[PDB]
């Protein structure tokens, strides 16, 4: 208003915006409801190794005690611990969960995993394998119907044994390989050849028993080589479709949208006009261009690597503008692991 004479001043209305990167690793673990040597509190929050020792002063032998001791020993960070009846509540609240691992629970865990997928929370679990010693005489399929088929998760069979103490479920071994990966070099690279320390596998599998379990589903054995030892081996998800294999290409799309959806919550109820459309289009591709130089998604002439478009008649025509909708679409081509390396000799 301009009621009285004098010196008035106004400032800018709106400023720029951009997305903040990630967290990339916050797991919740699988407590057991019938367990005794533990607290009756369902949800615990642990931040580092310090308070875990003052809460649990004695070294135990249970599967959860051997799992968190393997998480923190390879780095690790803020990790939760919930009972196996309250996953569907704990994911919908804490707003930062990435991994649902199974610390030796199978039956009631697979139902609570596919529950929070059904609402579309964009999460990535990972499961256990069978207990001991597939004989390898026959039956390649009947050990694989007890696992929920979905593009979220792997199984990690061979059951490392932790020669210091008792056995370790392999979800903890797989979760430790992701921690020293995203801290070292990105999330688009597979938790594939980074070695773990202090864990030996109980079995020696083969070179060819990997072969018959590489199609259909994704056993993803844990095999020890000469030189580098006790390393993980194979990064494959449960389906075999040419869009959704290769666990790192799933986690790339899984973490490239949880930072855009987190940022655009302060841009709703904004006027659906022309200066909005040229500002979101100029803010998204400035995040992808920072992601293309880092080697996350492959392609020259970076108009070929991705595309962003938003407008008035290419998308969201006039009648659905009157309903308030503001629809966009972006598409990008990620990288894939070089799982097979073949090389040809000739004479020329």
């Amino acid at each position: 208003t301009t009621t009285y004479p004098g010196v008035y001043l106004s400032e800018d209305a709106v400023s720029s915006f951009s997305v903040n990167s990630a967290a990339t690793a916050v797991p919740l673990f699988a407590y057991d409801s019938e367990n005794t040597n533990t607290i009756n509190k369902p949800i615990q929050v642990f931040r580092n190794w310090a308070e875990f020792t003052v809460e649990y002063p004695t070294p135990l032998e249970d599967a959860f005690y051997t799992s968190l001791s393997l998480w923190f020993m390879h780095g690790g960070g803020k990790c939760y611990l919930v009972n196996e009846a309250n996953i569907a509540d704990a994911v919908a609240q804490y707003d930062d969960i990435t991994l649902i691992v199974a610390a030796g629970t199978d039956t009631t865990t697979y139902t609570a995993f596919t529950t929070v997928v059904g609402q579309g929370y964009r999460i990535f679990g990972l499961f256990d394998g069978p207990k001991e010693k597939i004989a390898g005489t026959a039956k390649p399929d009947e050990v694989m119907e007890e696992y929920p088929t979905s593009p979220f998760g792997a199984v990690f069979y061979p059951w490392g044994t932790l020669a210091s103490g008792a056995a370790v479920p392999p979800s903890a071994i797989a979760a430790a390989s992701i921690t020293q990966t995203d801290r070292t070099r990105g999330v688009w690279k597979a938790p594939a050849n980074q070695a773990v320390n202090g864990v030996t596998p109980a079995f020696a599998v083969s070179d060819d028993f990997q072969g018959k379990y590489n199609q259909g589903k994704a056993l993803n054995m844990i095999r020890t080589f000469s030189g580098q030892g006790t390393v993980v081996w194979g990064a494959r998800t449960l389906e075999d479709s040419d869009n959704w294999r290769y666990i790192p290409v799933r986690r790339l799309f899984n973490a490239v949208e949880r930072d855009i959806q987190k940022s655009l919550n302060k841009l709703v109820f904004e006027p659906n006009s022309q200066p909005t459309w040229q500002r979101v289009k100029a803010a998204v591709d400035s995040y992808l261009h920072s992601l293309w130089q880092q080697g996350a998604l492959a392609g020259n002439t970076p108009a070929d690597a991705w595309f962003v478009q938003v407008g008035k008649d290419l998308t969201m025509t006039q009648e659905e503008i009157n309903q308030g909708k503001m629809i966009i679409k972006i598409g990008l081509a990620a990288v894939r692991p070089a799982e097979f390396i073949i090389l040809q000799f000739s004479q020329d």
Binding site: F269, P271, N322, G324
Partner: protein, 50 residues
Amino acid sequence: VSVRVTNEQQAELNPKGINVIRHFSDRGLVVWGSRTQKDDDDWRYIPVRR
């Protein structure tokens, strides 16, 4: 707020257009929704009316 509203009955109250005061964890209380009463495509929005 006096009564805590959740998202599953937000779906019912956002048609028959009435607005809602929401509670969030990080930023506290906030107003939510900007729809007027009668719901033809002539004027369904507060600013287009105002």
